[PDB]
Amino acid sequence: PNRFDRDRLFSVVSRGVPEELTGLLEYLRRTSKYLTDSAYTEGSTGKTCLMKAVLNLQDGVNACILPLLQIDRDSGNPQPLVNAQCTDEFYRGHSALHIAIEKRSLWCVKLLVENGANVHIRA
């Protein structure tokens, strides 16, 4: 349960169960890695864990966003994955805030904006 691959992270965040986020805290402190690294995001697009969380919300709410945000702010790279951006030619600038807004989910927008968020990022 300690070592989780990016597919494992995607599967955990897709279902929406927050209790399966355990073990990542020791995981990134072990190999000295961060959630912002390319080792846990899609190489082609750049979709991250938060993005995969936002692409599916059970009735406009997820309980797995808060643990991920708090673990990232505890042991993250100076950008808490909220201002980290994709490098795709088709989605150059497709921010997480944009995905939160596009799904008409105000609550996750509030969470992201109170957990630090650069609105003026290019898209």
Short mmCIF file of N, CA and C in Angstrom, two decimals:
data_model
loop_
_atom_site.label_atom_id
_atom_site.label_comp_id
_atom_site.label_asym_id
_atom_site.label_seq_id
_atom_site.Cartn_x
_atom_site.Cartn_y
_atom_site.Cartn_z
N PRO A 1 0.81 -1.22 0.00
CA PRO A 1 0.00 0.00 0.00
C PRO A 1 0.85 1.27 0.00
N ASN A 2 2.15 1.12 0.22
CA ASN A 2 3.04 2.27 0.27
C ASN A 2 3.32 2.83 -1.12
N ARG A 3 3.88 2.00 -2.00
CA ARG A 3 4.23 2.43 -3.35
C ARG A 3 3.00 2.37 -4.25
N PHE A 4 2.53 3.53 -4.69
CA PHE A 4 1.38 3.63 -5.58
C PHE A 4 1.80 4.27 -6.89
N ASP A 5 1.50 3.61 -8.00
CA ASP A 5 1.78 4.14 -9.33
C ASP A 5 0.74 5.18 -9.71
N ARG A 6 1.02 5.91 -10.79
CA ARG A 6 0.11 6.97 -11.22
C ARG A 6 -1.25 6.40 -11.60
N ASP A 7 -1.28 5.19 -12.17
CA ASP A 7 -2.55 4.52 -12.42
C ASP A 7 -3.28 4.22 -11.11
N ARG A 8 -2.53 3.83 -10.08
CA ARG A 8 -3.14 3.60 -8.77
C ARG A 8 -3.73 4.88 -8.21
N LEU A 9 -3.01 6.00 -8.33
CA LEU A 9 -3.54 7.28 -7.86
C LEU A 9 -4.79 7.67 -8.63
N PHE A 10 -4.78 7.48 -9.95
CA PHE A 10 -5.96 7.79 -10.75
C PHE A 10 -7.15 6.94 -10.32
N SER A 11 -6.93 5.64 -10.11
CA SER A 11 -8.01 4.76 -9.70
C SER A 11 -8.55 5.15 -8.32
N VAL A 12 -7.65 5.53 -7.41
CA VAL A 12 -8.08 5.91 -6.06
C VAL A 12 -8.91 7.19 -6.10
N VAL A 13 -8.46 8.19 -6.87
CA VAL A 13 -9.17 9.46 -6.89
C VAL A 13 -10.43 9.41 -7.75
N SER A 14 -10.53 8.46 -8.69
CA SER A 14 -11.70 8.39 -9.54
C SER A 14 -12.94 7.96 -8.77
N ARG A 15 -12.81 6.91 -7.95
CA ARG A 15 -13.96 6.39 -7.21
C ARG A 15 -14.47 7.42 -6.20
N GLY A 16 -13.57 8.17 -5.59
CA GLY A 16 -13.95 9.18 -4.63
C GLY A 16 -13.85 8.77 -3.18
N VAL A 17 -13.24 7.63 -2.88
CA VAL A 17 -13.07 7.17 -1.51
C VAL A 17 -11.86 7.88 -0.90
N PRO A 18 -12.02 8.58 0.22
CA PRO A 18 -10.89 9.33 0.78
C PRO A 18 -10.00 8.49 1.69
N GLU A 19 -10.49 7.32 2.11
CA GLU A 19 -9.73 6.48 3.02
C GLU A 19 -8.58 5.75 2.34
N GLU A 20 -8.58 5.68 1.01
CA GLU A 20 -7.51 5.02 0.27
C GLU A 20 -6.38 5.96 -0.11
N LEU A 21 -6.41 7.20 0.37
CA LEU A 21 -5.30 8.12 0.17
C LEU A 21 -4.17 7.91 1.18
N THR A 22 -4.34 6.99 2.12
CA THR A 22 -3.30 6.70 3.10
C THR A 22 -2.10 6.04 2.43
N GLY A 23 -0.92 6.28 2.99
CA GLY A 23 0.32 5.70 2.52
C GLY A 23 1.10 6.59 1.58
N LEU A 24 0.46 7.59 0.98
CA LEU A 24 1.17 8.50 0.09
C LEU A 24 2.08 9.44 0.88
N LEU A 25 1.67 9.78 2.11
CA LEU A 25 2.49 10.65 2.96
C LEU A 25 3.88 10.08 3.14
N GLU A 26 3.97 8.80 3.50
CA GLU A 26 5.28 8.16 3.59
C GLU A 26 5.88 7.95 2.21
N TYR A 27 5.03 7.86 1.18
CA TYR A 27 5.52 7.56 -0.17
C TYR A 27 6.38 8.69 -0.72
N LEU A 28 5.90 9.94 -0.63
CA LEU A 28 6.68 11.03 -1.20
C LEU A 28 7.84 11.44 -0.31
N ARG A 29 7.76 11.19 1.00
CA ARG A 29 8.87 11.44 1.91
C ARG A 29 9.96 10.37 1.82
N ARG A 30 9.72 9.28 1.10
CA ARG A 30 10.65 8.17 1.02
C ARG A 30 11.64 8.31 -0.13
N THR A 31 11.15 8.54 -1.34
CA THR A 31 11.99 8.77 -2.51
C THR A 31 12.26 10.25 -2.75
N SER A 32 11.80 11.12 -1.85
CA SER A 32 11.98 12.57 -1.96
C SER A 32 11.38 13.09 -3.27
N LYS A 33 10.08 12.90 -3.40
CA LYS A 33 9.33 13.31 -4.58
C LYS A 33 8.17 14.22 -4.17
N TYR A 34 7.51 14.79 -5.17
CA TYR A 34 6.39 15.70 -4.94
C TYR A 34 5.25 15.33 -5.88
N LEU A 35 4.04 15.72 -5.48
CA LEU A 35 2.88 15.49 -6.33
C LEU A 35 2.92 16.31 -7.61
N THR A 36 3.73 17.37 -7.65
CA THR A 36 3.87 18.19 -8.85
C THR A 36 4.75 17.54 -9.91
N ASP A 37 5.47 16.48 -9.56
CA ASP A 37 6.42 15.89 -10.49
C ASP A 37 5.69 15.15 -11.61
N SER A 38 6.40 14.99 -12.74
CA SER A 38 5.84 14.28 -13.88
C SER A 38 5.68 12.79 -13.63
N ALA A 39 6.24 12.26 -12.54
CA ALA A 39 6.12 10.84 -12.24
C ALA A 39 4.70 10.46 -11.83
N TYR A 40 3.84 11.43 -11.54
CA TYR A 40 2.46 11.16 -11.13
C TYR A 40 1.45 11.93 -11.97
N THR A 41 1.82 12.30 -13.20
CA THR A 41 0.92 12.97 -14.12
C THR A 41 1.12 12.39 -15.52
N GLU A 42 0.13 12.62 -16.38
CA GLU A 42 0.21 12.11 -17.75
C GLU A 42 1.30 12.85 -18.52
N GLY A 43 2.18 12.09 -19.17
CA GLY A 43 3.28 12.70 -19.89
C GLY A 43 2.83 13.51 -21.10
N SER A 44 1.79 13.03 -21.79
CA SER A 44 1.35 13.69 -23.01
C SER A 44 0.55 14.95 -22.71
N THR A 45 -0.55 14.82 -21.96
CA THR A 45 -1.39 15.97 -21.65
C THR A 45 -0.83 16.77 -20.48
N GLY A 46 -0.74 16.14 -19.31
CA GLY A 46 -0.28 16.83 -18.12
C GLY A 46 -1.33 16.83 -17.03
N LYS A 47 -2.40 16.08 -17.23
CA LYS A 47 -3.48 15.99 -16.25
C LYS A 47 -2.95 15.44 -14.94
N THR A 48 -3.27 16.12 -13.84
CA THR A 48 -2.76 15.76 -12.53
C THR A 48 -3.84 15.10 -11.69
N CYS A 49 -3.49 14.81 -10.43
CA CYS A 49 -4.41 14.11 -9.54
C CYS A 49 -5.66 14.94 -9.26
N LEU A 50 -5.48 16.24 -9.00
CA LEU A 50 -6.64 17.11 -8.78
C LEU A 50 -7.54 17.13 -10.00
N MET A 51 -6.95 17.20 -11.19
CA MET A 51 -7.75 17.24 -12.41
C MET A 51 -8.59 15.98 -12.56
N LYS A 52 -7.98 14.81 -12.34
CA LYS A 52 -8.74 13.57 -12.40
C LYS A 52 -9.81 13.52 -11.31
N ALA A 53 -9.56 14.16 -10.17
CA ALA A 53 -10.59 14.26 -9.14
C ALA A 53 -11.75 15.12 -9.60
N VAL A 54 -11.47 16.21 -10.32
CA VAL A 54 -12.51 17.15 -10.71
C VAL A 54 -13.32 16.64 -11.90
N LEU A 55 -12.71 15.85 -12.78
CA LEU A 55 -13.44 15.30 -13.92
C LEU A 55 -14.60 14.39 -13.51
N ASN A 56 -14.77 14.09 -12.23
CA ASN A 56 -15.89 13.27 -11.77
C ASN A 56 -16.21 13.62 -10.32
N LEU A 57 -17.41 14.12 -10.09
CA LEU A 57 -17.90 14.42 -8.75
C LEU A 57 -19.28 13.79 -8.57
N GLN A 58 -19.43 13.01 -7.50
CA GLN A 58 -20.71 12.38 -7.20
C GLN A 58 -21.66 13.45 -6.69
N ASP A 59 -22.57 13.88 -7.58
CA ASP A 59 -23.55 14.92 -7.27
C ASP A 59 -22.88 16.22 -6.85
N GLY A 60 -21.84 16.60 -7.60
CA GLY A 60 -21.16 17.86 -7.38
C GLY A 60 -20.41 17.98 -6.07
N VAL A 61 -19.84 16.88 -5.58
CA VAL A 61 -19.07 16.90 -4.34
C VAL A 61 -18.19 15.66 -4.29
N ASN A 62 -16.96 15.84 -3.82
CA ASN A 62 -16.03 14.74 -3.59
C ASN A 62 -15.37 14.93 -2.24
N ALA A 63 -15.18 13.82 -1.52
CA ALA A 63 -14.53 13.84 -0.22
C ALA A 63 -13.03 13.56 -0.30
N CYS A 64 -12.50 13.28 -1.49
CA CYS A 64 -11.08 13.00 -1.67
C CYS A 64 -10.27 14.23 -2.06
N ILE A 65 -10.92 15.36 -2.35
CA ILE A 65 -10.19 16.57 -2.72
C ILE A 65 -9.46 17.14 -1.52
N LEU A 66 -10.13 17.21 -0.37
CA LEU A 66 -9.53 17.79 0.83
C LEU A 66 -8.28 17.04 1.30
N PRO A 67 -8.28 15.71 1.44
CA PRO A 67 -7.03 15.04 1.86
C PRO A 67 -5.88 15.26 0.89
N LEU A 68 -6.15 15.23 -0.41
CA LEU A 68 -5.10 15.47 -1.39
C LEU A 68 -4.56 16.89 -1.28
N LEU A 69 -5.45 17.88 -1.14
CA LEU A 69 -5.00 19.26 -0.99
C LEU A 69 -4.16 19.44 0.26
N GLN A 70 -4.59 18.83 1.37
CA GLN A 70 -3.87 19.03 2.63
C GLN A 70 -2.52 18.31 2.61
N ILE A 71 -2.44 17.11 2.03
CA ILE A 71 -1.15 16.44 1.95
C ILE A 71 -0.21 17.21 1.03
N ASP A 72 -0.74 17.76 -0.07
CA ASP A 72 0.11 18.52 -0.98
C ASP A 72 0.62 19.80 -0.31
N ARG A 73 -0.25 20.52 0.40
CA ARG A 73 0.21 21.73 1.08
C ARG A 73 1.17 21.39 2.21
N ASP A 74 1.07 20.19 2.78
CA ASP A 74 2.01 19.80 3.83
C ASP A 74 3.39 19.47 3.27
N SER A 75 3.45 18.75 2.15
CA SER A 75 4.72 18.25 1.65
C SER A 75 4.85 18.44 0.14
N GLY A 76 4.51 19.63 -0.36
CA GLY A 76 4.51 19.89 -1.78
C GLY A 76 5.68 20.74 -2.24
N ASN A 77 5.71 20.97 -3.55
CA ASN A 77 6.66 21.81 -4.26
C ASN A 77 6.06 23.21 -4.08
N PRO A 78 6.85 24.30 -4.08
CA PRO A 78 6.26 25.63 -3.83
C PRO A 78 4.95 25.94 -4.55
N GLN A 79 4.71 25.41 -5.75
CA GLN A 79 3.38 25.49 -6.32
C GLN A 79 2.57 24.29 -5.85
N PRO A 80 1.45 24.49 -5.14
CA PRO A 80 0.69 23.36 -4.58
C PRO A 80 -0.21 22.68 -5.60
N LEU A 81 0.33 22.44 -6.80
CA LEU A 81 -0.36 21.75 -7.89
C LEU A 81 -1.62 22.48 -8.34
N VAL A 82 -1.90 23.64 -7.74
CA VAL A 82 -3.04 24.45 -8.17
C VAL A 82 -2.65 25.41 -9.28
N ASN A 83 -1.37 25.76 -9.39
CA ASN A 83 -0.89 26.64 -10.44
C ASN A 83 -0.01 25.90 -11.44
N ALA A 84 0.21 24.60 -11.22
CA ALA A 84 0.92 23.75 -12.16
C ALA A 84 0.02 23.55 -13.37
N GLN A 85 0.60 23.67 -14.56
CA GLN A 85 -0.17 23.76 -15.79
C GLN A 85 0.26 22.68 -16.76
N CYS A 86 -0.67 22.25 -17.60
CA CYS A 86 -0.39 21.30 -18.67
C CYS A 86 0.45 21.97 -19.75
N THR A 87 1.18 21.14 -20.50
CA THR A 87 2.06 21.60 -21.56
C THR A 87 1.62 21.06 -22.92
N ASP A 88 0.35 20.72 -23.05
CA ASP A 88 -0.18 20.21 -24.31
C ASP A 88 -0.44 21.34 -25.29
N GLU A 89 -0.22 21.06 -26.57
CA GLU A 89 -0.53 22.04 -27.61
C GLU A 89 -2.03 22.27 -27.72
N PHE A 90 -2.84 21.25 -27.42
CA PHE A 90 -4.29 21.37 -27.52
C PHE A 90 -4.92 22.00 -26.28
N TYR A 91 -4.24 21.96 -25.14
CA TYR A 91 -4.78 22.47 -23.88
C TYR A 91 -3.72 23.27 -23.13
N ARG A 92 -3.01 24.14 -23.83
CA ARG A 92 -1.96 24.94 -23.21
C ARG A 92 -2.60 25.97 -22.29
N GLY A 93 -2.59 25.68 -20.99
CA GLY A 93 -3.20 26.55 -20.01
C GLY A 93 -4.50 26.05 -19.41
N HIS A 94 -4.85 24.78 -19.61
CA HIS A 94 -6.11 24.24 -19.12
C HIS A 94 -5.97 24.01 -17.62
N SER A 95 -6.17 25.07 -16.84
CA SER A 95 -5.92 25.06 -15.41
C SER A 95 -6.95 24.21 -14.67
N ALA A 96 -6.59 23.82 -13.45
CA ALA A 96 -7.52 23.09 -12.59
C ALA A 96 -8.72 23.94 -12.20
N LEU A 97 -8.50 25.23 -11.97
CA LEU A 97 -9.62 26.13 -11.68
C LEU A 97 -10.62 26.14 -12.83
N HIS A 98 -10.12 26.10 -14.07
CA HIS A 98 -11.00 26.05 -15.22
C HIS A 98 -11.87 24.80 -15.19
N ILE A 99 -11.27 23.65 -14.88
CA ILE A 99 -12.03 22.40 -14.83
C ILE A 99 -13.05 22.45 -13.70
N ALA A 100 -12.68 23.06 -12.58
CA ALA A 100 -13.63 23.21 -11.48
C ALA A 100 -14.81 24.07 -11.88
N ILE A 101 -14.55 25.17 -12.60
CA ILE A 101 -15.62 26.07 -13.01
C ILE A 101 -16.52 25.42 -14.06
N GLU A 102 -15.92 24.72 -15.02
CA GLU A 102 -16.66 24.21 -16.17
C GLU A 102 -17.70 23.17 -15.78
N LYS A 103 -17.51 22.47 -14.66
CA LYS A 103 -18.45 21.45 -14.22
C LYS A 103 -19.54 22.00 -13.32
N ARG A 104 -19.64 23.33 -13.19
CA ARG A 104 -20.66 23.98 -12.37
C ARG A 104 -20.61 23.50 -10.93
N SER A 105 -19.40 23.28 -10.42
CA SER A 105 -19.17 22.86 -9.05
C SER A 105 -18.56 24.03 -8.30
N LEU A 106 -19.40 24.78 -7.59
CA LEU A 106 -18.93 25.97 -6.88
C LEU A 106 -18.08 25.60 -5.67
N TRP A 107 -18.39 24.49 -5.01
CA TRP A 107 -17.72 24.15 -3.76
C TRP A 107 -16.23 23.88 -3.98
N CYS A 108 -15.89 23.11 -5.01
CA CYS A 108 -14.49 22.85 -5.29
C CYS A 108 -13.77 24.12 -5.75
N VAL A 109 -14.49 25.01 -6.43
CA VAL A 109 -13.91 26.30 -6.79
C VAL A 109 -13.55 27.09 -5.54
N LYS A 110 -14.46 27.12 -4.57
CA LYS A 110 -14.18 27.81 -3.31
C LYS A 110 -12.98 27.19 -2.61
N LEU A 111 -12.93 25.86 -2.57
CA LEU A 111 -11.81 25.18 -1.92
C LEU A 111 -10.49 25.52 -2.59
N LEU A 112 -10.45 25.47 -3.92
CA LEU A 112 -9.22 25.77 -4.65
C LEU A 112 -8.81 27.23 -4.47
N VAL A 113 -9.78 28.15 -4.46
CA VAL A 113 -9.43 29.56 -4.36
C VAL A 113 -9.02 29.94 -2.94
N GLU A 114 -9.52 29.25 -1.92
CA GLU A 114 -9.08 29.50 -0.55
C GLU A 114 -7.82 28.73 -0.20
N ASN A 115 -7.45 27.73 -1.00
CA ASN A 115 -6.21 26.99 -0.81
C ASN A 115 -5.11 27.50 -1.73
N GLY A 116 -5.18 28.78 -2.10
CA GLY A 116 -4.23 29.36 -3.02
C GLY A 116 -4.60 29.07 -4.45
N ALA A 117 -4.64 30.10 -5.29
CA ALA A 117 -5.01 29.92 -6.70
C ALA A 117 -4.64 31.19 -7.46
N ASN A 118 -3.90 31.04 -8.55
CA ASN A 118 -3.57 32.16 -9.43
C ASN A 118 -4.61 32.19 -10.54
N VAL A 119 -5.52 33.17 -10.47
CA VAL A 119 -6.56 33.29 -11.48
C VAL A 119 -5.98 33.71 -12.83
N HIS A 120 -4.97 34.58 -12.82
CA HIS A 120 -4.50 35.22 -14.04
C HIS A 120 -3.61 34.32 -14.90
N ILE A 121 -3.59 33.00 -14.65
CA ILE A 121 -2.78 32.10 -15.46
C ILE A 121 -3.35 32.02 -16.87
N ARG A 122 -2.46 31.99 -17.86
CA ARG A 122 -2.86 31.92 -19.25
C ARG A 122 -3.54 30.59 -19.56
N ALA A 123 -4.41 30.62 -20.57
CA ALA A 123 -5.04 29.43 -21.12
C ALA A 123 -5.08 29.51 -22.64
#
